[PDB]
Amino acid sequence: FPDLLPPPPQRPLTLVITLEDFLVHSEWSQKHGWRTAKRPGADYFLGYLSQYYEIVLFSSNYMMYSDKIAEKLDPIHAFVSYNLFKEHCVYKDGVHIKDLSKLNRDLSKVIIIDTDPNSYKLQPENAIPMEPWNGEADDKLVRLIPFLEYLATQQTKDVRPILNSFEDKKNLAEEFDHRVKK
Numbered sequence: 495f496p497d498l499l500p501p502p503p504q505r506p507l508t509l510v511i512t513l514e515d516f517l518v519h520s521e522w523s524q525k526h527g528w529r530t531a532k533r534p535g536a537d538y539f540l541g542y543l544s545q546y547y548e549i550v551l552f553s554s555n556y557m558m559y560s561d562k563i564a565e566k567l568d569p570i571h572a573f574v575s576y577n578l579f580k581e582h583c584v585y586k587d588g589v590h591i592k593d594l595s596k597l598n599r600d601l602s603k604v605i606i607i608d609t610d611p612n613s614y615k616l617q618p619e620n621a622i623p624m625e626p627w628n629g630e631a632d633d634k635l636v637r638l639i640p641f642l643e644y645l646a647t648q649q650t651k652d653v654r655p656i657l658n659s660f661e662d663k664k665n666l667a668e669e670f671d672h673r674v675k676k
């Protein structure tokens with residue numbers, strides 16, 4: 495399998511985020527066909543965090559299906575460094591996986607945020623799992639920012655010891671809030 499990204503150009507950390515059920519959510523109908531909603535805070539999340547992270551938007555769908563959705567999130571291409579798709583996943587024991595060791599990045603400096611435990615199966619130590627977004631307006635993206643800002647503003651040398659210090663990474667933003675007095 496090919497390496498997927500050029501060598502770093504620069505930001506101290508790389509943030510790999512899934513598209514489907516994290517930034518957007520799609521539903522099909524007879525009346526309208528496929529329709530896609532954008533989560534509250536998505537534009538701000540990408541715009542603000544791009545100042546601290548190299549952002550890689552890693553879609554779980556084939557390019558032909560999600561290419562345009564991804565583009566709408568950053569039409570002028572100012573925030574997202576790279577777009578990857580299902581074609582870039584490796585296929586192992588019948589599941590597709592976002593193999594971070596193919597990103598040509600130091601894995602002490604990579605975070606992946608995904609909603610499908612298969613996607614981070616090869617690097618669970620780099621992962622922040624998220625409950626899939628259902629399309630209902632919520633503030634979960636905004637709540638994730640303080641931890642991500644913290645990682646970037648403290649260095650950080652290796653994100654993994656901190657990431658894996660939580661009781662339940664699915665509840666990371668809330669636990670981090672209780673751990674820190676701003």
Ligand SMILES: [Ca+2]
Binds near residue numbers: 671674675
């Ligand atoms: Ca707090």
Ligand SMILES: [Ca+2]
Binds near residue numbers: 671
């Ligand atoms: Ca708080």
